[PDB]
Amino acid sequence: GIVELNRQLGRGVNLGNALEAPWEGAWGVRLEEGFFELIREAGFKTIRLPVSWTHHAGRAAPYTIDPAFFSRVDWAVTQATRRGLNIVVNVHHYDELNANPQAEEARYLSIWRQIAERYRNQPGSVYFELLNEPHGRFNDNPQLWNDLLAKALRVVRESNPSRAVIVGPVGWNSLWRLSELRLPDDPNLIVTFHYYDPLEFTHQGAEWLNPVPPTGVVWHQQNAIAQAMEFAQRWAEQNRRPIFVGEFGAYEKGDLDSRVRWTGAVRSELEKRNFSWAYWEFAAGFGIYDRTTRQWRTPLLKALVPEQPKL
Numbered sequence: 001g002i003v004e005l006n007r008q009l010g011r012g013v014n015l016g017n018a019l020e021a022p023w024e025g026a027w028g029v030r031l032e033e034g035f036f037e038l039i040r041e042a043g044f045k046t047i048r049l050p051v052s053w054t055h056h057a058g059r060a061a062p063y064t065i066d067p068a069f070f071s072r073v074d075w076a077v078t079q080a081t082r083r084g085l086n087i088v089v090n091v092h093h094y095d096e097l098n099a100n101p102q103a104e105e106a107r108y109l110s111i112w113r114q115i116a117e118r119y120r121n122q123p124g125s126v127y128f129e130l131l132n133e134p135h136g137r138f139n140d141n142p143q144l145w146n147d148l149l150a151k152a153l154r155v156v157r158e159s160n161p162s163r164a165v166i167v168g169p170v171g172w173n174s175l176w177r178l179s180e181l182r183l184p185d186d187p188n189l190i191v192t193f194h195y196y197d198p199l200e201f202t203h204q205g206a207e208w209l210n211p212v213p214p215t216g217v218v219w220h221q222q223n224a225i226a227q228a229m230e231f232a233q234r235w236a237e238q239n240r241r242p243i244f245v246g247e248f249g250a251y252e253k254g255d256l257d258s259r260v261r262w263t264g265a266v267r268s269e270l271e272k273r274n275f276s277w278a279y280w281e282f283a284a285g286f287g288i289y290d291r292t293t294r295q296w297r298t299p300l301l302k303a304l305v306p307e308q309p310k311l
Ligand SMILES: OC[C@H]1O[C@@H](O[C@H]2[C@H](O)[C@@H](O)[C@H](O)O[C@@H]2CO)[C@H](O)[C@@H](O)[C@@H]1O
Pocket: 016, 017, 027, 028, 093, 208, 284, 285
């Protein structure tokens, strides 16, 4: 059942700054086969694979996805799966859809039909995630996302009747917007949110924000994490949905000891609430692995995968 498929997600990591950029490598991370073994050996069971299909699909119907790009996603799915890892395949950045859901609907639903048909025979360790962090017009009217996600789920279910499908709320997958999320009567949904509070800390110096939060911000634990995760757990219980927190992490412009405090505090509370999770992210500016030295960032890795349960 879906609660067990969510538990199987367990501990995971995002392969970020990769296929969700305009093209693979544009944001600094080209995928390598060796990543899968590294990630498995470090104690993770799941890869989250951000994919920004919009750059690679035709603009005119039938909105065909470039075959070479599709083959690269095939490779990532196969290499993770054969090596024992779960993989979450999503639609990630999609500026056009967040800006104009109605105008971009046909293209988005064609993209999902292509993905769903292509991967319909993959095992249950392959999960679909309908849309990363809805925002834009979905923030203005969260019901636009409720309507659209039901359409995309319907498309997926025409070829994948029971695959786990991961769905989050608006506000960039903000748990506070779970209140406005409405989901179909489908027994194989996993609900997701992302956790980056306080943005002033986790995203200090992140240039892709406007405004850019200043750096020099330290962090220690108070009660915000516990309050947030309990709110989300009660929503999940009230609606009988399992939870996967598909991104959390703190950017390298923050001081390391604060980042470690924050990362461990969040991981500990996620697991206390029986949330599966995926850390943002493997190898870039939030990374736990430094490709230049081929070394793990041990303080952060051990905050994710502690050697004793209360550490
Ligand atoms: O550039 C706008 C776009 O950036 C995304 O963040 C990237 C960033 O572009 C990249 O330079 C940096 O190294 O990593 C971050 C995180 O992947 C951001 O996620 C988008 O929301 C934004 O539209």
